[PDB]
């Protein structure tokens, strides 16, 4: 095991906006 | 014109390497039943996510002492022209990346 000192989650951005599908009734 | 026809956002941090966003969905149905019924249908939900990356750009230029002195004396420096050329090269590379892409870099 010869990894680095920083993990992926420390250099990752989570956008604060979700997308939803649209189902109109009629 | 690529920063003037498409929106520009400033959410990413200068020390990030990847961004991600989510999406959601659902399913279900209904039926016509009787008064004694034991088989009502069910519903559920979903989710998924995507990814994106960030890249770095760069160049450089050279100049000698004799050219510096000649620019100082003749009134036309040679370093500012090269600085302007470097800035123009960076901007044009950004525009070209937006409007043409890069196959090796996905």
């Amino acid at each position: 095991a010869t990894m680095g000192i920083w993990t992926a989650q420390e250099l990752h951005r989570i956008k604060s906006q979700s997308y939803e599908e649209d189902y109109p009734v009629g | 014109s690529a920063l003037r026809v498409f929106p520009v956002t400033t959410e990413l941090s200068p020390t990030d390497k990847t961004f991600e966003y989510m999406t959601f969905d659902k399913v279900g149905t209904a039926q016509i039943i009787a008064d004694y019924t034991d088989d009502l249908p069910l519903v559920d939900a979903l989710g998924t996510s995507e990814f994106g990356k960030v890249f770095r750009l760069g160049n450089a230029y050279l100049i000698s002492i004799d050219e510096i002195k000649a620019g100082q004396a003749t009134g036309r420096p040679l370093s500012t022209r090269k600085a302007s050329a470097c800035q123009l090269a960076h901007d044009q590379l950004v525009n070209r990346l937006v409007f043409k892409g890069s196959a090796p870099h996905k």
């Binding site: 189902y23 109109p24 009629g26 | 149905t29 088989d39 009502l40 559920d44």
Partner: protein, 156 residues
């Protein structure tokens, strides 16, 4: 200009989803052994512990007898290869009786009440090799690109 309104319909089912609220039965004291199981596929039992009580299950292979079908759970599953699966050395929800939606490899709708034939990999397929005691419950839908079929499971 004149206004407009639109209409859209949801999908019917998902892989490894319980069809309805009929008399079902879930076996939750099982553990995945040596591999991972796709939600919506059949499983087999390799060993039942005499005194500890747990049962070791794994993905179906050739020349074996199916025991149940894994079902969807938001809490007890892991999202891998863009699907939802049960990983090695963990508790698994196995359905042993009732109606369930499961993956299919067939191309034409089946006959209601006929016997189910499974493929070697644990997914339903017409003219398959593995024979079971399950019957078709009359369901033939499709998600965006995944074929699904409704199956009635009787306890062994």
């Amino acid at each position: 200009q004149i206004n407009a309104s639109y209409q859209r319909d949801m999908a019917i089912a998902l892989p490894g989803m319980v069809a309805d609220t009929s008399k079902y039965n879930i076996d939750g004291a099982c553990v995945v052994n040596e591999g991972d199981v796709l939600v919506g596929a059949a499983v087999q039992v390799v060993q039942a512990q005499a005194v500890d009580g747990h049962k070791l299950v794994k993905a179906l292979t050739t020349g074996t007898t199916p025991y149940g079908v894994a079902i969807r759970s938001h809490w007890q599953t892991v999202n891998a290869q863009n699907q939802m699966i049960y990983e090695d050395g963990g508790a698994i929800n196995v359905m042993t009786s009732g109606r369930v939606w499961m993956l299919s490899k067939s191309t034409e709708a089946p006959t209601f009440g006929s016997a189910v034939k499974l493929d070697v990999d644990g997914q339903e397929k017409s003219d398959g090799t593995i024979e079971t005691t399950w019957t078709y419950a009359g369901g033939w839908t499709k998600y965006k690109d995944i074929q699904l079929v409704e199956v009635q499971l009787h306890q062994l």
